[PDB]
């Protein structure tokens, strides 16, 4: 039986509310005819990368060890920043533990991936069938292509997993907000495609050769600009750090030499943020026995954005003469709090239809997916009874 994965980048829990649903007729046919959980809690920390790993490992960051989108490795010195450097490539980052499509393909399966964030790097010597790379934000237009050959890819058996990467609703979040009409716009136009997908299948004679699993890596929380930012250089001298990784809610520090308890007391002080020593991070995060977590880890409060200074933030090309935009939503805060949270849904005949699910994790995921597939799942931090409900 065919699986297609569709990540919805940023897609906030709440976006399929039932009030947003009466609006919404494609995610609405979905949730009617198929499997909607309340609620997908993802790991700590509730970025992007982090989340991809362990949507397709089952596995917490702290075993998957892709615990940052920006990660630096003092041993050799090369860093992960988010994808874009070319270092990014390098096994070092990947092989902390096999996800999916890799054990899919080295049982002889066959996958195709569309713009999908890691597709394009060789993971324990292996690559996916086949990658159409992930470069610049993905269009609304791409991401019904993808569908589109996706679906026949599947049917072809050219694939027996397809799995595409959606940006566009975390972008106008970040840009405009999560309650803005820039993001519901987004959002609708993803319902349309999904549409689409639901009026195609029935075209080529999928339904009963298909399961569709959508997911989201988080949600999206309001931010402050400029109230609430935090300066790292009001606090301390950057001269004192080795390294620093990321900017926003989570930022991983590497003190100098000689310099780690000055730069934890004097940060520890700091309000609307949490220092944690690596070894005190909490252990709800299953993230402190991350090889590549930093020696201070520092995580803002909700609505809080933490930079070295201010001229360090993220402002983003809403002009095109420089970056000089504002953002008004972000991401990375703990994982449990409730603008966090993301989606989960499914549709087909492996699946009951109209069920409510109860919440899972971001672990859970990989179980159902392998269950589908019909390859059995790697050892992984999934909880088998918190989704098996669901399944027909
Ligand atoms: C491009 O962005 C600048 C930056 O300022 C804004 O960034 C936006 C993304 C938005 O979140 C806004 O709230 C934020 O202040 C815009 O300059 C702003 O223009 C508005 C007028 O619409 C003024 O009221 C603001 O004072 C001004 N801010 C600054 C810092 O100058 C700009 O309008 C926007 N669009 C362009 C340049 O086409
Ligand atoms: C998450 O799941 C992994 C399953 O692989 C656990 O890690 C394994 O634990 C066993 C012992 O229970 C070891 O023999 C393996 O070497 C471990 N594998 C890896 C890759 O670390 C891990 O303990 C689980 N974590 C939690 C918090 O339950
Ligand atoms: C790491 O590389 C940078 C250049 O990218 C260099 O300036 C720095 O000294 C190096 N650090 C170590 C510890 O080798
Ligand atoms: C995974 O990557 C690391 C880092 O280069 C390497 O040492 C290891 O041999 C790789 N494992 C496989 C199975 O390729
Ligand atoms: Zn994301
Ligand atoms: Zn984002």
Same mark, same amino acid.
């Given at each position: 039986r065919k699986l297609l994965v569709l990540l919805l980048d940023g897609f906030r829990s709440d976006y399929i509310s039932e009030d947003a649903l009466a609006s919404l007729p494609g995610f609405r046919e979905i949730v009617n005819r198929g499997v909607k959980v309340d609620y997908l809690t993802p790991d700590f920390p509730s970025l992007s990368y982090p989340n991809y790993y362990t949507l397709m490992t089952g596995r917490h960051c702290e075993v998957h060890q892709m615990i940052g989108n920006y990660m630096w490795d003092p041993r050799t010195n090369k860093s992960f920043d988010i994808g874009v450097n070319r270092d990014s490539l390098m096994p070092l980052w990947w092989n902390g533990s096999e996800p999916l499509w890799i054990t899919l393909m080295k049982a002889r399966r066959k996958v195709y991936m569309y713009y999908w964030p890691g597709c394009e790097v060789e993971i324990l010597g292996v690559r996916p069938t086949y990658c159409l790379e992930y470069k610049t934000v993905p269009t609304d237009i791409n991401f019904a292509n993808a569908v589109s050959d996706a679906?026949?890819?599947?049917?072809?058996?050219?694939?027996?997993?397809?799995?595409?990467?959606? %940006?566009?609703?975390?972008? %106008?979040?970040?840009?405009?907000? &999560?309650? +803005?009409?820039?993001r519901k716009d987004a959002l609708r136009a993803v319902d349309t495609v999904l549409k689409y997908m639901i009026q195609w299948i029935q075209d080529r004679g999928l339904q009963q050769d298909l399961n569709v699993i959508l997911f989201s890596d988080h949600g999206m929380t309001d931010i402050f600009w400029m109230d609430k930012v935090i300066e790292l250089s009001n606090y301390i001298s950057l001269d004192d750090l080795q390294q620093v990784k990321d900017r926003g809610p989570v930022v991983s520090l590497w003190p100098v030499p000689g310099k780690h308890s000055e730069i934890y007391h004097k940060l520890r002080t700091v309000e609307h943020m949490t220092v944690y020593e690596k070894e005190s991070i909490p252990n709800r995060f299953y993230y402190k026995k991350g090889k590549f977590v930093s020696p201070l880890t520092l995580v803002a409060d909700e609505g809080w954005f933490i930079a070295e +200074?201010? %001229? =360090?933030? &993220?402002?983003? =090309?809403?002009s095109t003469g420089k970056r000089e935009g504002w953002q008004r939503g972000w991401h990375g805060y703990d994982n449990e709090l409730m603008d966090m949270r993301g989606i989960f849904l499914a549709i087909g005949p492996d699946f009951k239809s109209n069920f409510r699910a109860a919440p899972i994790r971001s672990v859970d995921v990989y179980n159902i997916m392998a269950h589908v597939a019909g390859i059995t799942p790697l050892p992984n931090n999934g909880s088998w009874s918190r989704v098996v409900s669901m399944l027909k």
């Open positions: 679906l026949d890819s599947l049917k072809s058996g050219r694939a027996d997993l397809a799995a595409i990467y959606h %940006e566009r609703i975390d972008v %106008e979040g970040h840009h405009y907000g &999560p309650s +803005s009409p820039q +200074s201010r %001229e =360090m933030l &993220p402002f983003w =090309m809403n």
